[PDB]
Amino acid sequence: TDLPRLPFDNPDIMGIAPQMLALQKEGPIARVGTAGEDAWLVTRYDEVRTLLADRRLRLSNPNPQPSAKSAARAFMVALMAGDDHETEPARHAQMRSLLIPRFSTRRLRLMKTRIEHHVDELLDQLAASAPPVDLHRVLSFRLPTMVVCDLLGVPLADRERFGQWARGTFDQSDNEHSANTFQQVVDYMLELVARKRVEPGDDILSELIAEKDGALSDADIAHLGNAVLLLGYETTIVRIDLGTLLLLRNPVQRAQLAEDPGLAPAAVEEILRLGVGGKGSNALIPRYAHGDITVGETVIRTGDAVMLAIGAANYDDRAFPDGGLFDLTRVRPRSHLAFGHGARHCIGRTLARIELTAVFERLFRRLPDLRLAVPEESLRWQEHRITGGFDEIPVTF
Ligand code: HEM
Ligand SMILES: CC1(C)C[C@H]2C=C(C(=O)O)[C@@H]3COC(=O)[C@]4(CO4)[C@]23C1
Numbered sequence: 001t002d003l004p005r006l007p008f009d010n011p012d013i014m015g016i017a018p019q020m021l022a023l024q025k026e027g028p029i030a031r032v033g034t035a036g037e038d039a040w041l042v043t044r045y046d047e048v049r050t051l052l053a054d055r056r057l058r059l060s061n062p063n064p065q066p067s068a069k070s071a072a073r074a075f076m077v078a079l080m081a082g083d084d085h086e087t088e089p090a091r092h093a094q095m096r097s098l099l100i101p102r103f104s105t106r107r108l109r110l111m112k113t114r115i116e117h118h119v120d121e122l123l124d125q126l127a128a129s130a131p132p133v134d135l136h137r138v139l140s141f142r143l144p145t146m147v148v149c150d151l152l153g154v155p156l157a158d159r160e161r162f163g164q165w166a167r168g169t170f171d172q173s174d175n176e177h178s179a180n181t182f183q184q185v186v187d188y189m190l191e192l193v194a195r196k197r198v199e200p201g202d203d204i205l206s207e208l209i210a211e212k213d214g215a216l217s218d219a220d221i222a223h224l225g226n227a228v229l230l231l232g233y234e235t236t237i238v239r240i241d242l243g244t245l246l247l248l249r250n251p252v253q254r255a256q257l258a259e260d261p262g263l264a265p266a267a268v269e270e271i272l273r274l275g276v277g278g279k280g281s282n283a284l285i286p287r288y289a290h291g292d293i294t295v296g297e298t299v300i301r302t303g304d305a306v307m308l309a310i311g312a313a314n315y316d317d318r319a320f321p322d323g324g325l326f327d328l329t330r331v332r333p334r335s336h337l338a339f340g341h342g343a344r345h346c347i348g349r350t351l352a353r354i355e356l357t358a359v360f361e362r363l364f365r366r367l368p369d370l371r372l373a374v375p376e377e378s379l380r381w382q383e384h385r386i387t388g389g390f391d392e393i394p395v396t397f
Pocket of ligand 2: 283
């Protein structure tokens with residue numbers, strides 16, 4: 001008897017920690033320690049998917065004496081309208097109602113075209129440069145920040161101002177840095193709302209300003225803009241890096257994709273499913289029980305914390321035969337959980353899929369000799385950031 005303690009060690013730079021796969025083999029749910037509260041850890045696909053659709057399991061904390069959180073986690077929960085369990089139903093419903101129509105089929109088709117041209121240009125710049133090159137700086141970082149500039153209607157150079165703010169806001173190791181970074185985001189967004197009130201364009205804040213004959217306050221609109229800025233590029237950057245690394249590890253699949261770029265949607269779904277970095281603390285969706293819930297033989301009690309391991313569930317052999325293998329020829333794969341499921345299902349997921357498809361349609365056809373310029377083991381996953389990620393990806397080609 002030894003209580004498992006999150007985060008678990010992972011001897012590889014990607015994948016699922018061995019201890020978490022061991023727990024998955026024993027059963028769907030286990031009690032574990034963490035750096036803070038103890039929590040229920042749910043690791044099997046069926047149970048994670050069921051619990052993500054359970055309205056009794058919510059982001060907000062219902063407890064009278066709530067455990068202390070990092071500034072970074074507090075900001076993340078507040079951006080997601082989860083900071084007050086009594087107002088979360090109305091506030092979260094409004095948040096999704098206001099953001100979902102900002103990603104319309106008209107907008108996504110226009111952005112798909114612009115994204116494809118931008119990838120072409122980014123890869124031409126890359127191909128013309130002298131290796132070794134940092135792929136993270138010149139490709140992974142550049143496409144999703146371009147997209148956020150487009151969503152917000154700001155000059156592309158603005159991403160040189162805001163490009164580190166998601167990392168800084170979500171730095172769990174430094175509350176002062178987290179809070180100072182978030183104030184920069186807030187000031188920038190309030191400036192942007194005031195500009196869009198007199199100079200609107202085809203962009204998200206302009207649409208929110210016009211919503212309900214201007215019924216929303218500038219603070220309400222800036223709040224939603226802050227969610228788009230802080231959630232809308234960093235995780236996509238991380239998936240471009242993880243997808244590149246996964247494809248570099250699987251040369252037979254990589255050659256399949258280079259030969260037939262029509263395999264890119266299937267590759268993107270495998271990248272999302274398998275793309276887990278380091279100790280994988282970002283591949284856990286946190287919840288609190290607002291009512292008692294039974295999982296198998298186990299009772300989750302009102303007030304308990306729950307970690308839904310979407311990463312482990314996406315590796316679950318019960319849901320994906322040979323679940324640890326990258327295979328873009330899977331026939332009718334189950335829907336992975338990398339965008340979540342249920343009430344808080346990723347709002348940007350169709351846009352994120354368009355970005356990743358445009359990149360991986362092109363990458364290995366444009367740079368067939370691309371490969372790491374350093375050992376994989378030298379790549380360092382940043383455990384202190386809620387969103388993890390690598391800081392650099394040196395390549396040659
Ligand atoms: C590959 C990139 C991405 C991944 C892997 C990802 C993953 C996720 C996951 C797992 C959730 C659910 C969190 C939870 O249930 O607690 C989520 C929510 C969310 N995502 Fe994404 N995301 C990505 C890209 C984006 C983009 C590009 C946008 C917008 C431009 C975006 C906007 C949001 C928002 C606003 C939420 C909160 C939804 C809610 O709380 O109702 N995400 N994302
Ligand atoms: C809103 C989020 C940025 C989406 C989710 C994906 C993430 C990631 O891939 O890094 C974030 C990690 O931390 C979380 O609590 C998550 C898992 O819900 C995320 C919050």
